[PDB]
Amino acid sequence: KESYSVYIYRVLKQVHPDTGVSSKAMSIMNSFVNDVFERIAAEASRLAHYNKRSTISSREIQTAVRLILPGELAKHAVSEGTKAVTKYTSSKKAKSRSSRAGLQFPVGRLHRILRKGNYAQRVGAGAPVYLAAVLEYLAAEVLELAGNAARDNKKTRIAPRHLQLAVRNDEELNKLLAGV
Amino acid sequence: GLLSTNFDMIQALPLNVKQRVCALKNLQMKTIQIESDFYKRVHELEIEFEGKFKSTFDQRKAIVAGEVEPTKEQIDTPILEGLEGDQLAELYKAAEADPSAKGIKDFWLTALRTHDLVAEAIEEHDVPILSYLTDVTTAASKDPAGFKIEFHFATNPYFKNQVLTKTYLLGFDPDAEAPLQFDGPHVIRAVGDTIEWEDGKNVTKKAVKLTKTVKADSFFNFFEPPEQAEEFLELDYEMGQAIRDTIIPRAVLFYTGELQSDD
Amino acid sequence: LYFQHMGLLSTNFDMIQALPLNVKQRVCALKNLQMKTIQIESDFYKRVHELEIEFEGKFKSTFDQRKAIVAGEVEPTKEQIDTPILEGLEGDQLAELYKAAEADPSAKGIKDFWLTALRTHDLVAEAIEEHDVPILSYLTDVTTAASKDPAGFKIEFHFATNPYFKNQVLTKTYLLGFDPDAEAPLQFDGPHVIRAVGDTIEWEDGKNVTKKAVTVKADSFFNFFEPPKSKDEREQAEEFLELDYEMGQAIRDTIIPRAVLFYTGELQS
């Protein structure tokens, strides 16, 4: 039941700088992010419930992402998560984990939610970085398509109907977000 | 002490210059003693202002509990500061009045769990317990120097206590054995409160198999404070500071979530 | 912690939205009560400011004695000499250090004291460029004082006679607002900078490290004495203004009270 609205909004300004988003469309975005997060986390736990300490690493998230996300979304998400981890382990006023990874989505909060749900409890620092990049990539893809549909319909604000056009008319987003 | 950033420079200093640095160390100790008096006066200032803050917090508790009704001047305050006229009127129309809903349910639970530091301490089995929290208050003292935080719970099936008290004892003087540390008031002791749990409700304890009783994760270990012992106390104190300095004075901003952090 | 000025981005917006109207109106009352709490807090911060002014007279003597030591104007007393140069070390370990370098009668005071202290602080060190270094060697003292009317504080940088500029004191002044912003009252977190006021540096010919020929502004610590202007004198400029103020706070609140600990590097990050 978590809110990523401020991060979803910052991502929106990156792909569509002069486009807004309605409050109901923002609720739907949050549902997308929460649903994908829960599914990715539940499988990352199940895959790490069988090693000794049960420690969710960047590599468990990577495998859960390959399983949950379809085809090309999976390849691009894995690309994004890999780059975020590499930039994060390469990185150094104290800079937040999200900005060290070059991300808008909140690494620290996702670490807390991962550690909390006891999904194979013990979480490595790379895992929220990778997962934040995956959810941010998915948010950016949806927002890009929904923004395009919005100003094709002569609007400057993403409405719920622009999200459904973005999702249902994209083969892989539709398979990923069908149950939501 | 040999970890100092500029040790090699210090070592190379000629002796007559070294003695001047020593003089500066002695003068620095005197500065810190004066700083200690400053913090004592600030602590008294905080005590003085408790009476000034009290009425706003009382009125807030009465509103949260449903004991008093909002005035017209109160009703005309925007529920969220950020909104424009149009969007605000929508928001007020999104859900009709419900006369069976008294006060503001889950106010303190929502406020506490929206703060990222306190959210770290809240487990899911703590959530229904914190639903019974009706008020959170704080007060400071000169004798013994420190402050307390009190958590008021309505009658509930989890424990019998009606007030859970957390007390911090503070040292305001520089440590005679390390005077140059002094960074302000520092915790001597934390004193919690014994929770009188109803049968089978103690989420702070679990057994593992000899059969031992070990600590389970829960917000309510906040009321059982402590070579690791210094790591717990500092993070316990910092959570206490957050509640006293940040959450209590600005509770409704955490309830609405208008105060955010980017960890 | 930041205040979310876009209300629809509020973390608990959907919960708020779903609240029945009679509950919403109770939250509205709490917002009104919160504004009153903030007004009382602003009075608290004014009282703290008064306390800081009051204690200036008490701190002054320790800082003055420090400047005299740094300049070589006074000799350490026996009790000062017996104070360990580094806090952790015991008699045996100290006698090592005190024998590691023989006295040098040509060395007066503590050369480069304030330069070293400032450059050991990570925030201020970022602002010190290499052509600033020989100028800051002439810094004999850094002082600060606060005022009630007009509300704010100043930092004064005292320079010995030097070939870079003629000024003996460079002053940086911050005017602070202690009241909540009437059009955005809920964000109030304490005093906020209204304006920063610098000082005119009377550079000797060809020594102005704040200027370069491409004539453009060059990077230099001494641009601290050309602060960014407030809006009533002109955007991105207000983030520049906040970063200037933050460095002023670092110097006043941290480096000045604990200068020798930054000189030794006993204060770490």
From Swiss-Prot, chain A:
Keywords: Chromosome, DNA-binding, Glycoprotein, Isopeptide bond, Nucleosome core, Nucleus, Ubl conjugation. Glycans are attached at residue 79. There is a cross-link at residue 87 (Glycyl lysine isopeptide (Lys-Gly) (interchain with G-Cter in ubiquitin)). It is found in: Nucleus; Chromosome. Core component of nucleosome. Nucleosomes wrap and compact DNA into chromatin, limiting DNA accessibility to the cellular machineries which require DNA as a template. Histones thereby play a central role in transcription regulation, DNA repair, DNA replication and chromosomal stability. DNA accessibility is regulated via a complex set of post-translational modifications of histones, also called histone code, and nucleosome remodeling. Belongs to the histone H2B family. This is Histone H2B 1. The chain holds residues 31 to 121 of 122 of the full protein.
